[PDB]
Structure 1
Amino acid sequence: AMIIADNIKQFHSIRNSLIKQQKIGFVPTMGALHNGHISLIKKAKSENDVVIVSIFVNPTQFNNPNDYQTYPNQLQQDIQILASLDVDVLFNPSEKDIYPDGNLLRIEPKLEIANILEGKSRPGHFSGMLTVVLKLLQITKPNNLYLGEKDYQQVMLIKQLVKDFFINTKIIVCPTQRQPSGLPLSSRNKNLTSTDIEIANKIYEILRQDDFSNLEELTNKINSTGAKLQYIQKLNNRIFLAFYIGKVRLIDNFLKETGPSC
């Protein structure tokens, strides 16, 4: 029953066949679906008549080229997951569909929350992300856009994007889905080896015990587990941090009063 649109020409046909009384929900992903994505999709199934899910590994938001090649790819598994959830339309475009002449016109963020944290650590990422989200919103034209809380700056920037370019879409932010240890579900965690999981469980054991009053002391407790902390910083009752376990980069953010709570 689920419609799969491999290119933008077929999607335009599907999208143009919907009338203005149908509530349309849109969940953009880069595939490799986990319960974090599924929590977003179930939220959209309950508030909308039509749920569109996009799968597109956007090259322009990958500052690290090795990250782009080793990004998890499980398309057939994702289609099975999406069909199980009764998703109406899957939008799975190619690079030349979204960038017919390459990346010539780009959204550039010139504000503070784009210059710190993920933006400071990932140059060019937010520009690539914002450009493709605008393209996808211009394509899908949804009533409701669903975003995960795990990418907090991404949520804030897209909220600014929808406002500044007058897109008539409501943004629904969903809580981060976590393993019992507190580790946020993430597609890149597929690359984590056996001991790597044990290392990540050590860190969140620490994070759930710490009051985050001494961030330098906490940095040492984290690096002792074998991971390499990239940054950790408090920003408005909310702790942001990113670290490396092996060749896998992990990010997380959470309230200070709760920690990585379940």
Structure 2
Amino acid sequence: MRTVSTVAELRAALPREGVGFVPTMGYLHRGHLALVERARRENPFVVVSVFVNPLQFGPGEDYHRYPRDLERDRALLQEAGVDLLFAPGVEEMYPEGFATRVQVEGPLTALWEGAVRPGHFQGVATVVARLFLLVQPQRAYFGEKDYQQLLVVRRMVRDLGFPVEVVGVPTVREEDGLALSSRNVYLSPETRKKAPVLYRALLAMREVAGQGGSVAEALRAGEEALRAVPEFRKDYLAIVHPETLLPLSDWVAGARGIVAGRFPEARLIDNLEVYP
């Protein structure tokens, strides 16, 4: 695996065909590797980027606190069979004079995570657009854990016409169900025990949906699950349309349950298909 940190070397190290791409912010875990394997198996050349993007971190968030361990990532990727690792510095990605932004507007970015993290999706859209242009991938892989982000990237791709196939990969979970996330390291031993509540709430809703319950009844079951863990401050809990993320008035194939909230030392999010 060749490691590069500049745009110049990146472009020269890239073939024009069969590129599978996996954008990440470093401090990789079992979950990221699932994306890399998927990419490795489907494309002759695999590229993974590691870059903590300042643009998607807003006021009051964890930019400087974000987990960083390049050598650990470089060793993990090298072993995963990745051909190219792009680990640029902030000034390589955003040199002096940088002033362009890409943003998906409307309900897709105004609701849920967009309401809790204003400006977050503009930062994501901007860095993804740039990465797609620098890498020119045939396929790009994203985790379903960040479902809204996945839809935002798909919308930007469809709207602007990027010739990139965006692939969503199922969420990797711990035995107790806690979705893997680099931010889980924030959790203390005690909070980690309560963390499974998000997935628990989501399962409660899927259960009602399977028993023939209404959307409203499913939401109630989910609310109750969360209420049992007051330490968890809920941001939102809903059952939304799989493509528009609008609250559902009735069930539709692919109905998505989404939840988010925060414990004192960290914020967590999760989602799951509740119907059928």
Query: Fold match, TM over 0.5?
Result: yes
Find the partner of 2:262 among 230, 244, 247.
244
Query: Does residue 161 of the first structure (1) align with residue 179 of the second (2)?
Result: no
Q: CA deviation at 1:10?
A: 1.4
Greater alpha carbon shift after TM alignment, 24-33 vs 248-257: 248-257
Q: CA deviation at 1:84?
A: 0.8
Taking the aligned partners of 2:144 and 2:25, their CA distance within structure 1 comes to 16
Please provide the CA RMSD for this pair. 1.9
2:187 maps to 192
2:246 maps to none
Superposed, which structure 2 residues align to 1:67-216 within 5 Å?
67-101=62-96, 104-210=99-205, 211=208, 213=217, 215=219
Greater alpha carbon shift after TM alignment, 204-213 vs 95-104: 204-213
Superposed, which structure 2 residues align to 1:58-73 within 5 Å?
58-73=53-68
- Check the 8 A contact 1:181/1:205 in 2, yes or no: no
2:44 maps to 49
2:10 maps to 11
Gaps of 5+ in 1: none
- Check the 8 A contact 1:219/1:229 in 2, yes or no: no
Flag the 1:172–1:180 CA change in 2: closer, same or farther, 3 A: same
Taking the aligned partners of 2:100 and 2:119, their CA distance within structure 1 comes to 14
Taking the aligned partners of 2:198 and 2:35, their CA distance within structure 1 comes to 26
- Check the 8 A contact 2:199/2:270 in 1, yes or no: no
Flag the 1:63–1:83 CA change in 2: closer, same or farther, 3 A: same
Flag the 1:169–1:202 CA change in 2: closer, same or farther, 3 A: closer
Amino acid at match of 2:109: A
- Check the 8 A contact 2:104/2:121 in 1, yes or no: yes
Q: CA deviation at 1:34?
A: 0.9
Amino acid at match of 1:169: V
SS in 2 for 1:183: coil
Greater alpha carbon shift after TM alignment, 103-112 vs 134-143: 103-112
Taking the aligned partners of 1:217 and 1:167, their CA distance within structure 2 comes to 41
- Check the 8 A contact 2:27/2:73 in 1, yes or no: yes
TM-score (normalizing by structure 2): 0.86
Q: CA deviation at 1:201?
A: 2.8
Query: Does residue 232 of the first structure (1) align with residue 237 of the second (2)?
Result: yes
Query: Does residue 256 of the first structure (1) align with residue 274 of the second (2)?
Result: yes
SS in 1 for 2:67: coil
- Check the 8 A contact 1:223/1:229 in 2, yes or no: no
Give the paired residue count. 253
Q: CA deviation at 1:214?
A: 5.6
Identity rate, percent: 34
- Check the 8 A contact 1:44/1:51 in 2, yes or no: yes
Greater alpha carbon shift after TM alignment, 90-99 vs 208-217: 208-217
- Check the 8 A contact 1:181/1:201 in 2, yes or no: yes
Taking the aligned partners of 1:206 and 1:113, their CA distance within structure 2 comes to 23
SS in 2 for 1:69: coil
- Check the 8 A contact 1:53/1:90 in 2, yes or no: yes
- Check the 8 A contact 2:141/2:167 in 1, yes or no: yes
SS in 2 for 1:136: helix
Taking the aligned partners of 1:174 and 1:88, their CA distance within structure 2 comes to 20
- Check the 8 A contact 1:60/1:103 in 2, yes or no: no
Taking the aligned partners of 1:65 and 1:103, their CA distance within structure 2 comes to 23
Flag the 1:42–1:214 CA change in 2: closer, same or farther, 3 A: closer
Q: CA deviation at 1:66?
A: 3.9
Taking the aligned partners of 2:198 and 2:40, their CA distance within structure 1 comes to 35
Q: CA deviation at 1:216?
A: 5.5
Q: Deviations over 1:123-165 (max 9, x none)?
A: 0000000000000001001111111111111111111212222
Amino acid at match of 2:237: I
